[model samples]
Target: GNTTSSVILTNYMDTQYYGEIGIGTPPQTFKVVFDTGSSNVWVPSSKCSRLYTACVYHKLFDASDSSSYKHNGTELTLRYSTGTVSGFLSQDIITVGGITVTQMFGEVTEMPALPFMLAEFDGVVGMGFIEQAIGRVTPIFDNIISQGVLKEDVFSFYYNRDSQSLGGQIVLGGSDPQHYEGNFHYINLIKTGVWQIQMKGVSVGSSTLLCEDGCLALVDTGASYISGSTSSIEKLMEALGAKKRLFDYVVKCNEGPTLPDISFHLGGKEYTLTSADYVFQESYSSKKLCTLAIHAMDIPPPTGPTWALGATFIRKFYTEFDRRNNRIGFALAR
Candidate 1:
């Protein structure tokens, strides 16, 4: 099939990215995050009463309103980088881009308040492998290809760095060459579930900084910053002259340009990130400060060593998640 569907995403504050999708008959639309980090789909349920605080702000999914909706009361709980949500499984016609598929999804009756109350998306559609899906249900993308809806079991993401511009697109079925240029450097996934690749090491110009013996670097679209284990990331940051201020790493704004480009040793090439690519600038009490957008956290094993290369990296490269081949490809963004 010579078909691909694209959805223009809304880049919220250059942190969260989401686009519209529909579920059930008559196609009720809601904003969703096409997350490559996790494997499952969930949305606030109509069961969450109007009096329920979080549901009052989120777009709720009503199964009774749809002709194709199915009842499946299997309870499940989903934990994420920030919060937890509990719900029951339900079947419905899910519409992504322009393709429709009958799939199992979460009808979330319970949700936390902090991130959800302030989030721009109503739900998340995971693009990662099925191994991590709650209840062992196949992920939406896997179902999309297995049903023969698409020829190439592939998808790609293009993120516009400018918050003022279009948020970029998620091209279903294949890559959009228009979003990238030249040749792609492809790397095979080292594990299942998450979209992870082997990190030979990370470097600053000619110097190798960390991950010397190797680690798993996740290509995480759901994350906004690059992260690593507590000791690992701290060693890398301090090595580069970043100072800890409160809970953040701060540097003089004037030093932003003086910072060297960081590179991730992947496959057979070095994916380089410029100083502008790593430093996040903020104004504090009329003084300009730069925050190194790297965080410390140990993402435990099988997928251990948890060094996530987030949107900070994705924004600089054109990324492809190839399910058919079980590999990830990166190219310079247009």
Candidate 2:
């Protein structure tokens, strides 16, 4: 029987959105980042030393407390551009929103200080393809599909821009029609690994920033802001009359509502993002300041000029990841 669960996604400073998941037999809950960028699930282990101050605030997993815990004795090391995570893989039951997957994931034994030190979320739940999974660990979504536990081998996200409200939902198994308007615009996955899609280009008014010919766009839910080629970012900032302060391109907060919509050409159709979507108010800044949502990341060859479309793009278009057909879909959020 196919079942579904509505996982509430909480917003973080208009940057990242995450949800809670229950792990182990008795179920110890941990708030985790729902990342589509990577394909390995992880949480802080109970054995984590006190030296890591952030780990103290998070709920750790104790394999001894769970009767269903299975030790695989396999070591897993996940490398990210930001940091690295090394841990021994163990299987345990995981529950999200009412749907439970038994022996579904690897319980993290150790993680880098960078992730937990800065993040409000305790760990990460990667929702990418099985091919991207580390140590051949079966992804939670894959298990849900293979076990026929969900109605559809798909999941969709609806993120609200209103940071003040509790207004985001991740529907595991199928899409929620109430969260979106009209039919979905489907896009084929150009490659394996991350959720990569083909893009015609990005433009503001009649001026183009990058991808005149074609470029690959990586949809990453783990990322807080959008990142593009250095050249593209510089051009976009100039167009927006923004100044690079430290690492971010700062703009006048009051001009946000009046700025033009930047259009992203995908599958020959245009997906427009208004200034409200591009100009983000700095939540931590002492002064009322805003910044362009796009940042610069000049990745090396094989991944060069790739557009890292993050939370801003997803919030504008309620995205759906479909493993059954190997295609992703997007629709206007309601």
Candidate 3:
């Protein structure tokens, strides 16, 4: 089945970077990836400060414009799925939808992997998760909610990968029903900063793999697939009498057993979905082709006893990333 997804980008014109702004003779524009998995919104400065590869765009953060663009010399660090980046902290003008929020924190890169820092993208707008934190800081949504602009604390995500015109929407106040075509099944909500929930088990077609009934599973809109630890459910496949295949050194499906039927239990309610929701075809395009798209990865030895239920998994249900409530929600897509 086809799906929907949209990259969170700042439409702010000439405001280099997605989160931070440039302050030069004539300011430029930048767009960045606002990620909740990490902290700190950085930008490639007008002064590379070192030899660096040019990213995709030219808009860079210029400290010369704003009087507040001061060097705090404060250190900042960011971690990603692949590696970690460290840099210095500075002050700059931050704008969101014509709102000139002042004294916003921005990082000046001291050292970064060139591949991770794309051009035109000043840097990332970090949203703090449980494991990834910045300078012992709380999640940015906590601060946003404290300001009282939101009610009931809400955040939502709808990832669409195929339709350029009718992608997906994130409803913060609640889950949006427009993202799906048919009725849906739902599961219980995870109560932590990390999007996780308890799963009973999975059943594909006539085959079923019984989970521990209450084992914790994560629901990540940031993820691209429903990944299980080698121990989590992979080893149980053969015992359950199901077939499997190897994908990029990871276990995946080949034919119609395609995916197993899965259910989510939430507050005594159940939302069930099928295997097609988790499988995707391969052609291999560059990352620049699309944002919030799913690419496969093979985890290192001794899997972390964790599962990365990426973006593709979230699209199966209408999910709300409630920043105000400090919890995530799943609703039937209308």
Ranked by TM-score, top first: 1, 2, 3
Q: List the residue pairs that clash in candidate 1.
A: 301-304
TM-score for each model: 0.93, 0.91, 0.66
lDDT by residue (105-180, candidate 1, tens digit) is 9998888787688788998898888887879988998888877767588899998787767887899988888889
TM-score of 2: 0.91
Best by TM-score: 1
Cα-lDDT of candidate 3:
0.47
lDDT (Cα) of model 1: 0.84
Q: Model 3 clash tally?
A: 40
What stretches of model 1 exceed 4 Å from their correct place?
A: 49-52, 245-248, 282-286
User: After aligning candidate 1 to the native by TM-score, how far in Å is the CA of 232 from where it should be?
Assistant: 1.4
Instruction: Tell me how far the alpha carbon of residue 98 in candidate 1 is from the true structure, in angstroms, after superposition.
Output: 0.5
Per lDDT, what order, best first? Answer: 1, 2, 3
The better-scoring model by TM-score among 1 and 2 is: 1
lDDT tens digits by residue: candidate 2, 230-331? 788888878887788867788767666767778889887898887767886555343567777788876555645588888888888889998878788999
